[PDB]
Design a protein around this ligand. Structure first.
Ligand SMILES: Cc1cnc(Nc2ccc(F)cc2Cl)nc1-c1c[nH]c(C(=O)N[C@H](CO)c2cccc(Cl)c2)c1
Length: 346
């Protein structure tokens, strides 16, 4: 059985020639060759069954990605696991192969205003579909945006994604410490169980900033420092913004802080399209409720060249509260992961 950096990839005879691409908390992703379809693929190995959060994440990533069909979202071509539940210790998710990620590209390359323009368009096109399906991504960042040779873009890694049916009040039930620090909306710190899909718009904000500078905008070294970096540029929240913070303990924490002034965008990004900076501002708005939503952001002037509602599919079938009940023991999540991967067994 082929191995990559001390990691066994039991992908039978069909898939061969494994190269490393990257890793995550509970597995590794490789490039491979499908001998059946004569095409190169990506294979993400997952080993989650020891820890309950990993099984919950694995089940969502698979259910969500299996219903999604969109040109700016990575899909699932195939899934491999043992013939019986007792033997299943690993799940292999076969996905389409991309050439690079936006993280890698920004190390080697300063992007034309046209490239930034077109990348941002694609991120929001796919985000439109994600949000349309009552899903939050919750870890948008450059290394979860894939690119190929023809400048086509795909959102990947739905490990931290989940359904929030907008017909239920989820304030108090959402997981606490989501997103990657530098891309973390302020309300994840101040309202850590009450946030919304608007946290994805924040993340896109930070990505746009990073595309204009080749430098991350809010590089906090630790949890409460991140909030300082944000406040460092946006300036202290207005009274109206502290009025929209329902959590008294966090309202007080903010009042306690020394007044900081807003740093205008054009001093941070002197060479940058004024329309880019207008959208950057509406995305990096402190108050989640005032923050630009995904449709309004596609409709912004900066993206008028690409914006067309008739070519921006939404989900035929949005996810509803019934497909959220996954607060269950890990042995029962294992059985649910078994059932969902069945459609790919002989
Ligand atoms: C699906 C896919 C398809 N093509 C490529 N191409 C690629 C991407 C980045 C590179 F540096 C080089 C290459 Cl060739 N990458 C991917 C890909 C990159 N990351 C992921 C992906 O899902 N990565 C996440 C890490 O956040 C992951 C991976 C393994 C286990 C876990 Cl638990 C999590 C898929």
């Amino acid at each position: 059985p082929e191995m990559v950096r001390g990691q066994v990839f039991d992908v039978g005879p069909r898939y061969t020639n494994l190269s490393y691409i990257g890793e995550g908390a509970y597995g590794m992703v490789c490039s491979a060759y499908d001998n059946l379809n004569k095409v190169r693929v990506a294979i993400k190995k997952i080993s989650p069954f020891e820890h309950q959060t990993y099984c919950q994440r694995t089940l969502r990533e698979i259910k969500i990605l299996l219903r999604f069909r969109h040109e700016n979202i990575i899909g699932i071509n195939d899934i491999i696991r043992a013939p019986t539940i007792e033997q299943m210790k690993d799940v292999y998710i076969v996905q389409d192969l991309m050439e690079t990620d936006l993280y890698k590209l920004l190390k080697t390359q300063h992007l034309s205003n046209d490239h930034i323009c077109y990348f941002l368009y694609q991120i929001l096109r796919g985000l439109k579909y994600i949000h349309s399906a009552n899903v939050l991504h919750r870890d948008l960042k450059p290394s979860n945006l894939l690119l190929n040779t023809t400048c086509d873009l795909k959102i990947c890694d739905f490990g931290l994604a989940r359904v929030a049916d907008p017909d239920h009040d989820h304030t108090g039930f959402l997981t606490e410490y989501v997103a990657t620090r530098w891309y973390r909306a302020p309300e994840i710190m101040l309202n850590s169980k009450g946030y919304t899909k608007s946290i994805d718009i924040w993340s896109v904000g930070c990505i746009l900033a990073e595309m204009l500078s080749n430098r991350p905008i809010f590089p906090g070294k630790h949890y409460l420092d991140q909030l300082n970096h944000i406040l460092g540029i946006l300036g202290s929240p207005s009274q109206e913004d502290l009025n929209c913070i329902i959590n008294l303990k966090a309202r007080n924490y903010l009042l306690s802080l020394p007044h900081k002034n807003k740093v205008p965008w054009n001093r941070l990004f002197p060479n940058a399209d004024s329309k880019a900076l207008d959208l950057l501002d509406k995305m990096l708005t402190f108050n989640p409720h005032k923050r630009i939503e995904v449709e309004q952001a596609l409709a912004h002037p900066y993206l008028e060249q690409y914006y067309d509602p008739s070519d921006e599919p939404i989900a035929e079938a949005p996810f509803k509260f019934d497909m959220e009940l996954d607060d269950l023991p890990k042995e029962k999540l294992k059985e649910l992961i078994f059932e969902e991967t069945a459609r790919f067994q002989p």
